CSV table of C-alpha atoms and ligand atoms in Angstrom, one decimal:
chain,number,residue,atom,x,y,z
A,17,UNK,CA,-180.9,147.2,-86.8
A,18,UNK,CA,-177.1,148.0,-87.9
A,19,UNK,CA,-177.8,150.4,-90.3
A,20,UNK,CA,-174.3,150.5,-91.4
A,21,UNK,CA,-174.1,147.0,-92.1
A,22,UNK,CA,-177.2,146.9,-94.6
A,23,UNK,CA,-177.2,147.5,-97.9
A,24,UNK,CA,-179.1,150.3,-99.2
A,25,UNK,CA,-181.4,149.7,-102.3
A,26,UNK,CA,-182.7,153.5,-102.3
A,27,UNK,CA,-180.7,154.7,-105.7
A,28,UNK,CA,-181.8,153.5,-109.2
A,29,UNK,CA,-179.1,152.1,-111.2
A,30,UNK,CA,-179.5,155.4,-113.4
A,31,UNK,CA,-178.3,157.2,-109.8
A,32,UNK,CA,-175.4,154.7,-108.7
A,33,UNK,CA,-174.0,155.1,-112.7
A,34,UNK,CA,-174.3,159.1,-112.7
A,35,UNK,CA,-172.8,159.0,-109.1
A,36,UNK,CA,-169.5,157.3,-110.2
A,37,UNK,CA,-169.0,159.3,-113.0
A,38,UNK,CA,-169.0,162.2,-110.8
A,39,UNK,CA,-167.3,160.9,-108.4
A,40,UNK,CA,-164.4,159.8,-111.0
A,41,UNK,CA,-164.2,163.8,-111.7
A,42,UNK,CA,-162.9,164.1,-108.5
A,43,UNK,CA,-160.0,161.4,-109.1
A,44,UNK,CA,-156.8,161.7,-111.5
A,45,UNK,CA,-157.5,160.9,-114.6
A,46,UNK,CA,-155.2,158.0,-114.4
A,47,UNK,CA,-157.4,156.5,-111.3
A,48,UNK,CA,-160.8,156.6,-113.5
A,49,UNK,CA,-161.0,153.0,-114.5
A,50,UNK,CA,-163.9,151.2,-112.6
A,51,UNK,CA,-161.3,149.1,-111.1
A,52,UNK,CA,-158.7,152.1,-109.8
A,53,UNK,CA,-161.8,154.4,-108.9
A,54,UNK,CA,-163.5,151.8,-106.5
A,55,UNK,CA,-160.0,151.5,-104.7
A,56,UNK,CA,-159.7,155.2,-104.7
A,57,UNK,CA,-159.6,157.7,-101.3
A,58,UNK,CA,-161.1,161.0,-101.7
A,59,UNK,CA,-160.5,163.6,-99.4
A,60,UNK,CA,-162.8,165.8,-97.8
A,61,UNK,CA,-161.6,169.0,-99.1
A,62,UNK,CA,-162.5,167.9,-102.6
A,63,UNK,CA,-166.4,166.1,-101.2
A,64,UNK,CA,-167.1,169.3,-99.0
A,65,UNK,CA,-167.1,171.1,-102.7
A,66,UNK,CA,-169.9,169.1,-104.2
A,67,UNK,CA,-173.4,170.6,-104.1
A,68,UNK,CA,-175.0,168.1,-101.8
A,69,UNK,CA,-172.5,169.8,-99.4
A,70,UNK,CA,-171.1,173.2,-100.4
A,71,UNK,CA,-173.8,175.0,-98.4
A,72,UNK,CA,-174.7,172.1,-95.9
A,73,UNK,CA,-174.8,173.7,-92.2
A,74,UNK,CA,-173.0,170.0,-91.3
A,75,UNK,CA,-171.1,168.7,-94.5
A,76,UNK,CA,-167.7,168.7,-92.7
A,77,UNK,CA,-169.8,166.3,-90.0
A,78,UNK,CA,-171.6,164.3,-92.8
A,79,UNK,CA,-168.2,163.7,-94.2
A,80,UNK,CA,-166.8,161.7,-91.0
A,81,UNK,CA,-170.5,159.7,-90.3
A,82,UNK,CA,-170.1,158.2,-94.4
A,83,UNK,CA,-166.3,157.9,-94.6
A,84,UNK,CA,-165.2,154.1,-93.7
A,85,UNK,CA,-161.6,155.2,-93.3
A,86,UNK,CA,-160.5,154.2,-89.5
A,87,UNK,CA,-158.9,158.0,-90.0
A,88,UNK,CA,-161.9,159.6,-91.2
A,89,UNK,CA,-160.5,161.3,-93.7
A,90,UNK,CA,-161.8,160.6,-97.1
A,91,UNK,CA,-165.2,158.6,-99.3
A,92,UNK,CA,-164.3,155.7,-101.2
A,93,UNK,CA,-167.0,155.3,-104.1
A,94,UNK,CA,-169.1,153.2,-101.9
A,95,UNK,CA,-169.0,156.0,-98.8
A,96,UNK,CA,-170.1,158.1,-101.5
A,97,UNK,CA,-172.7,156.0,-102.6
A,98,UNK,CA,-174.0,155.5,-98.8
A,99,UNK,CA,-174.1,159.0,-98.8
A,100,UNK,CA,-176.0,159.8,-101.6
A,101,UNK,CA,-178.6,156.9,-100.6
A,102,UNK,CA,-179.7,158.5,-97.5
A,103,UNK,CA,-180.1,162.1,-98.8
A,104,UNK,CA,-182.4,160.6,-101.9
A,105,UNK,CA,-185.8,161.5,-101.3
A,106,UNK,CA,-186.2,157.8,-101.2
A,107,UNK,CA,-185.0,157.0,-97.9
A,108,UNK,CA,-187.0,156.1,-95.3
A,109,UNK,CA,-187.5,158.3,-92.0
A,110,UNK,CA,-186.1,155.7,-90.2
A,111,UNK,CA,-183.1,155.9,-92.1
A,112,UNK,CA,-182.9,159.3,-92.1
A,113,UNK,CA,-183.4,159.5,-88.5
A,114,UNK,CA,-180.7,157.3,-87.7
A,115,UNK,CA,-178.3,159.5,-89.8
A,116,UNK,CA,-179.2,163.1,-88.7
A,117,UNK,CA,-179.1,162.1,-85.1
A,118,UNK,CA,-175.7,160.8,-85.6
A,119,UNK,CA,-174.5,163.9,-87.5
A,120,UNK,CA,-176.0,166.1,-84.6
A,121,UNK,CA,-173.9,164.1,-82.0
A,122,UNK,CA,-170.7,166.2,-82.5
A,123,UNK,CA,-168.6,164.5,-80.3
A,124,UNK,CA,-170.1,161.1,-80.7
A,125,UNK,CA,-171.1,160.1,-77.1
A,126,UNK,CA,-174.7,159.1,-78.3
A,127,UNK,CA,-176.5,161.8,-76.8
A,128,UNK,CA,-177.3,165.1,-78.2
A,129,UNK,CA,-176.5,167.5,-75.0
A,130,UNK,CA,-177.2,171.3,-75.2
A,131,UNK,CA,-174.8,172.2,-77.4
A,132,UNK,CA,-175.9,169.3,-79.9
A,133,UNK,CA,-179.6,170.9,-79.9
A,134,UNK,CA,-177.9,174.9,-80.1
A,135,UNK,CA,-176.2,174.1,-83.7
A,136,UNK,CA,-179.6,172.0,-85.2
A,137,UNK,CA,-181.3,175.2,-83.7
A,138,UNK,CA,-179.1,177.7,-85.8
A,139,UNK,CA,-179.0,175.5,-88.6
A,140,UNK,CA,-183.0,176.2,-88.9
A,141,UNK,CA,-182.7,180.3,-88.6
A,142,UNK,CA,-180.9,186.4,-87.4
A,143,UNK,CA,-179.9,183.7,-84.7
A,144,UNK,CA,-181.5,184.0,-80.9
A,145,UNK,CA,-179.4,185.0,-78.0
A,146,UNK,CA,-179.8,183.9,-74.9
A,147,UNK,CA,-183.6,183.0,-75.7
A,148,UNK,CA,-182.0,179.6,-77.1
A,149,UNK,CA,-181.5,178.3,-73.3
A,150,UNK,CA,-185.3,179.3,-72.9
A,151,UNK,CA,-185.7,177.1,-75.9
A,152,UNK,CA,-183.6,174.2,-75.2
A,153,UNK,CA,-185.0,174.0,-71.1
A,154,UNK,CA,-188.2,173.5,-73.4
A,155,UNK,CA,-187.2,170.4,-75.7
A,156,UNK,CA,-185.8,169.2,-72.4
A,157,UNK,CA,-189.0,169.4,-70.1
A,158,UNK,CA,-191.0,167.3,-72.8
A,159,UNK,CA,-188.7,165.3,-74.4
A,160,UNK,CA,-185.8,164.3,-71.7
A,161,UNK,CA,-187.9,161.2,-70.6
A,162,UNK,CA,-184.8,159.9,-68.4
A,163,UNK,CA,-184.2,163.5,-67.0
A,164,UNK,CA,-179.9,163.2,-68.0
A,165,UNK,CA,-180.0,166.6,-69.3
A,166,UNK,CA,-179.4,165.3,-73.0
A,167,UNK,CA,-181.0,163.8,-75.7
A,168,UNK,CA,-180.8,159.9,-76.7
A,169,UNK,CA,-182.0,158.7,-80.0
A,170,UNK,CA,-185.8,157.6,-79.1
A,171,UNK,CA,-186.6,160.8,-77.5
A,172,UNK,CA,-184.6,162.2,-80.6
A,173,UNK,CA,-188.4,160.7,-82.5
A,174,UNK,CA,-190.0,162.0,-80.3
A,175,UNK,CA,-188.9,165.6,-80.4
A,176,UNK,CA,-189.3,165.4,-84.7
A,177,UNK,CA,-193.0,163.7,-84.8
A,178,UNK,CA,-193.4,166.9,-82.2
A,179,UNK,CA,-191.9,169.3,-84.0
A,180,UNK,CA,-192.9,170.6,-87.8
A,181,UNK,CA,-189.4,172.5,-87.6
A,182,UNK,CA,-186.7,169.9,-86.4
A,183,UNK,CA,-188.3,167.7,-88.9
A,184,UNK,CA,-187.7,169.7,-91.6
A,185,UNK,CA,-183.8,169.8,-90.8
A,186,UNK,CA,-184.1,166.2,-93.0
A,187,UNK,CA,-184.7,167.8,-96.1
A,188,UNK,CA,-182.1,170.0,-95.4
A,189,UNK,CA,-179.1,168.3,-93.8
A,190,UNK,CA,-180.1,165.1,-95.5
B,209,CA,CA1,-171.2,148.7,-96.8
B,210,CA,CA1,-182.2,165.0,-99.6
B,211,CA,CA1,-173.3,164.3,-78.1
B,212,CA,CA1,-182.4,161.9,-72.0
């Protein structure tokens, strides 16, 4: 499937347009040339500002999944871009899926372990205590078809077409 590697037709041209001009606000104005801007290198601290992030539960995680940089440290245009796609209300649950399960794997492994499920937990609520272990066990005991303790990216489906609540962390990480 290769999400990464498709090219994403969920933004009007309206949406790409509006996009780079605000994306160019974020550049010098020297760099704001279509040419200059689309080679430009925008740091997090400047993206992590925007609305689509400023009160995002994961935007400093969102930030390294979009960023093509081998150091992970800043959007082009087109990370930008990628970004926007999947949060429009256009893109497809599949999509969507792919992206928040990546974002929830914090150290990247491919599996969303206890920890993983603790933060997409708090993200959703006065926290819980140590009622969130009663919680997890319980994700775990229906959805941990292969018994590792963690949480791969098909049972990651099945936990959101069995939960109302994780699937509503789309609409508001993505
Ligand atoms: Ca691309
Ligand atoms: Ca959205
Ligand atoms: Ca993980
Ligand atoms: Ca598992």
């Amino acid at each position: 499937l290769l999400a990464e590697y498709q090219d994403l037709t969920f933004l009007t041209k309206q949406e790409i347009l509006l996009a780079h001009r605000r994306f160019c606000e974020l550049l010098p104005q020297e760099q704001r040339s279509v040419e200059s801007s689309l080679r430009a290198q925008v740091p997090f601290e400047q993206i992590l500002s925007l609305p689509e992030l400023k009160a995002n539960p994961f935007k400093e995680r969102i930030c390294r999944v979009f960023s093509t940089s081998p150091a992970k440290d800043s959007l082009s245009f087109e990370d930008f871009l990628d970004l926007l796609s999947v949060f429009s209300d256009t893109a497809t649950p599949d999509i969507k899926s792919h992206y928040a399960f990546r974002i929830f794997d914090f150290d990247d492994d491919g599996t969303l372990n206890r920890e993983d499920l603790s933060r997409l937990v708090n993200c959703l609520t006065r926290l819980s205590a140590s009622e969130m272990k009663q919680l997890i066990d319980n994700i775990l005991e229906e959805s941990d078809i292969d018994r590792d303790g963690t949480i791969n990216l098909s049972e990651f489906q099945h936990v959101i077409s069995r939960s109302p609540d994780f699937a509503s962390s789309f609409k508001i990480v993505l």
